[PDB]
Subunit: 208 residues, 2 copies
């Protein structure tokens, strides 16, 4: 079964990842979604290991303007970034990517805190939220609002790495984690899991 | 020990991944580098599983002009892409990312074959090659030229996922694969491994 939204919010509030399913009519994919403000090096490593590794950062339009993150050019990718910080090295390590996420969420964030282009991909949520666009991007920002966090999330799609093949640089039968698998994945890692659909139902209780 | 360049070229010619080390003075990082033209779904899955998951595609300046891939904004990222193909779905799966790579390398590639923005990150190699810029981007394109392949490679940095933590969404002590580890990683997966430095020495035999 899927977890009830309130419980997903409490977990998100606690700085945990949550597994979020969009509509089968849509991608039919699940993403790991976490608040960016305090994402750790170790959690980032886990995210990278268990996802596509294309680590994105959903944020509001207000943050894209404050931080001077224009659209790269439908997923609203902004220009990519790295943390302008003395501890950053190449920008790709779990350390560096988590740092960038945290910095994007900082109340004191400024445009100069980010090197462009880089290795983290901010995504512009639509003003109307999940009831307006049923995407993981909106879901991330929606969870932030709901949990009282800074308006920046971190998301990544949970791929299915397929099976190991001893001594060969290939994986058999890879794909994307779907439905049932998603819930099982969540249970295995002690995470809450829910659907965007339920998230919307939750938000309509207050917004209609 | 590192493999001799000629042997690395033969492997690359065979459509295998090769492990390439840049300078310690530089990133001190190793990347998986493969020819894009025939990268398979299964190999892509392996690449994703064993790297940062930020799958890039080194290509020449001539290809950036032919394909209308302007700079996103130092790593020369162009605008990102997805394959405009009936089999593409969300653009992130190993299937979809490998397809995009293959399409970027097609002799019949045209700008309209790519949706922008997307999930694969082409990188513009500098005209002068590895002797001009000692980057993995140049190395990828340099291997393509050397092996007689289409002038598009696929690269990704080999991260160190750290250690599993049973039932917890974290990984302990993550980092990047370095030196020794790199060679061991290559042996484990039956891949050749070399340094950019040696690659340059190879190219100077002909170019001075």
């Amino acid at each position: 079964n899927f977890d009830a939204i309130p419980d997903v919010i409490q977990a998100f509030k606690n700085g945990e990842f949550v597994v979020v399913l969009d509509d089968p009519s849509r991608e039919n994919e699940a993403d790991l979604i976490i608040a960016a403000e305090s994402v750790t090096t170790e959690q980032m490593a886990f995210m990278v290991r268990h996802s596509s590794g294309l680590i994105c950062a959903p944020l509001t339009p207000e943050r894209t303007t404050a931080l001077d993150l224009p659209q790269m050019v439908g997923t609203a990718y902004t220009v990519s970034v790295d943390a302008e910080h003395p501890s950053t090295t190449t920008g790709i390590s779990a350390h560096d990517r988590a740092l960038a996420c945290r910095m994007l969420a900082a109340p004191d964030a400024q445009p100069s805190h980010f090197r462009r282009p880089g290795h983290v991909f901010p995504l512009r949520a639509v003003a109307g939220g999940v009831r307006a666009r049923r995407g993981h991007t909106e879901a991330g920002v929606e969870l932030c609002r709901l949990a009282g966090k800074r308006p920046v999330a971190v998301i990544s799609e949970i791929v299915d790495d397929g099976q190991e093949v001893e001594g060969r640089a290939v994986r058999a039968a890879p794909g994307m984690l779907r439905g049932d698998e998603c819930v099982a994945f969540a249970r295995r890692w002690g995470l809450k899991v829910c659907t965007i659909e339920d998230m919307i139902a939750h938000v309509e209780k207050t917004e209609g």
